[PDB]
Ligand binder design. Structure first.
Ligand SMILES: [Ca+2]
Ligand SMILES: [Ca+2]
Ligand SMILES: [Ca+2]
Length: 399
């Protein structure tokens, strides 16, 4: 079968569980679309009622920050009439506003501005859908795909720069506050049976090194790359290339969302993370199989310095095998970050800078995560992971 008609293999990760992930492979001809702009993409996707098997080939670059005539939209197009960055900055400056939550005119105007952009960039993917890049240059720029449905395949697309023109200041986010933005490349919001494969995720032409600092904190226009939340379940992410980005993959959005327990069953394999700061993945609750991934970066990088690879969040059950981490000077312990409620991690075959390490033991974590993955393909020796992943991961490697 061609790219549009291929399904996730019956052994290939958590996405293969129960009914598996077949996307729109059973599509009739009348439900096979080629799209090359926002209008064509939105028309092909339709509404949540569009559950018939469908295949959508993306041809070329689809810029999601465009109006209905495909004219590019920017800050002043989306801006609420009452919003002004200078005044927003003046209103909420810690030196005069303190650490209370931004409220009043400018914050309300910013929130409205954000909803204006959201209307353009954020799109829901309906059930039984395969979206695949045609050739080696299929791109989604500025877009935030959301999957709340069942049975979706996304492959061979370079997702670039899910950019929020209106980051929100939160003075209570960390010891010196932070700016936060809303858009991921892909958000799995309660979605199930999903395969994300041979995609690339990056910050395009607007990396975080091009954003100024306000209040001494980076004016952060980006959110996640591939996030999973709200009971998202049975997902395989394979052969993806994540690069040049801060927060990559957050699985389970809140310590309070205890309904995520028993869900967030995700398999990550053969992914490349280059110059990714953190959360690759950060996990709460989920049985997450992480195998044969390659991580490369620098703690002293000026654009995207490595912080950690695996986030051991509340009640997380990461099962890691034969992953390779290349970050000069990094200790075995610092390959991961342990958050309150995180007590367990299984990792075997972990290679840090060419040396075999035990990340779990280095962090005093239990190795008992209470499960072992039964749905997986062949496991590469750690020794071949770097080569295999660099050669095979990302968009434009199939076509
Ligand atoms: Ca935050
Ligand atoms: Ca976020
Ligand atoms: Ca997110």
């Amino acid at each position: 079968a061609d790219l549009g008609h291929q399904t996730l293999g019956s052994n290939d990760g958590w996405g293969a569980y129960s009914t598996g992930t077949t996307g729109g492979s059973k599509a009739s001809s009348s439900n096979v679309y080629t799209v090359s702009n926002r209008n064509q993409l939105v028309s092909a996707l339709g509404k949540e009622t569009n559950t018939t098997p469908k295949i959508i080939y993306i041809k070329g670059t689809i810029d999601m920050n465009v109006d209905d005539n495909l004219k590019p939209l920017g800050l002043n197009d989306y801006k609420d009439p009452e919003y002004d960055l200078d005044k927003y900055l003046k209103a909420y400056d810690p030196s005069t506003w303190g650490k209370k939550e931004p409220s009043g005119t400018q914050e309300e105007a910013r929130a409205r501005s954000q909803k204006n952009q959201k209307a353009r960039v954020m799109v829901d993917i309906p059930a039984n859908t395969t979206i695949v890049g045609s050739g080696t240059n299929a791109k989604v720029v500025g877009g935030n795909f959301q999957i709340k449905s069942d049975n979706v395949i996304i492959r061979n697309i370079e997702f670039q720069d899910a950019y929020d023109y209106f980051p929100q200041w939160d003075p209570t986010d960390g010891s010196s506050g932070n700016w936060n933005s809303q858009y991921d490349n892909i958000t799995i919001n309660g979605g199930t049976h999903i395969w994300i494969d041979h995609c690339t995720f990056n910050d395009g032409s607007r990396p975080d090194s091009t954003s100024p600092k306000y209040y001494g904190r980076k004016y952060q226009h980006h959110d996640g790359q591939t996030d999973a939340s709200n009971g998202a379940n049975y997902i395989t992410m394979s052969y993806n290339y994540y690069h040049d980005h801060d927060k990559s993959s957050i699985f389970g959005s809140s310590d309070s969302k205890t309904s995520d327990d028993g869900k967030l069953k995700i398999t990550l394999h053969h992914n490349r993370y280059k110059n990714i700061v953190q959360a690759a993945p950060r996990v709460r609750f989920g049985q997450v199989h992480v195998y044969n991934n390659y991580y490369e970066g620098s703690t002293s990088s000026s654009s995207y310095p490595f912080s950690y690879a695996w986030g051991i969040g509340k009640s997380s059950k990461i099962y890691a095998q034969n992953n390779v981490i290349d970050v000069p000077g990094l200790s075995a312990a610092k390959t991961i970050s342990v958050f309150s409620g995180g007590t367990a991690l299984y990792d075997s075959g972990t290679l840090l800078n060419g040396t075999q390490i035990n990340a779990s033991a280095a962090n005093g974590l239990s190795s008992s995560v209470g499960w072992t993955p039964s749905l997986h393909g062949s496991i590469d020796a750690s020794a071949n992971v770097k080569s295999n992943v660099i050669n095979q991961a990302g968009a434009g490697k199939l076509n």
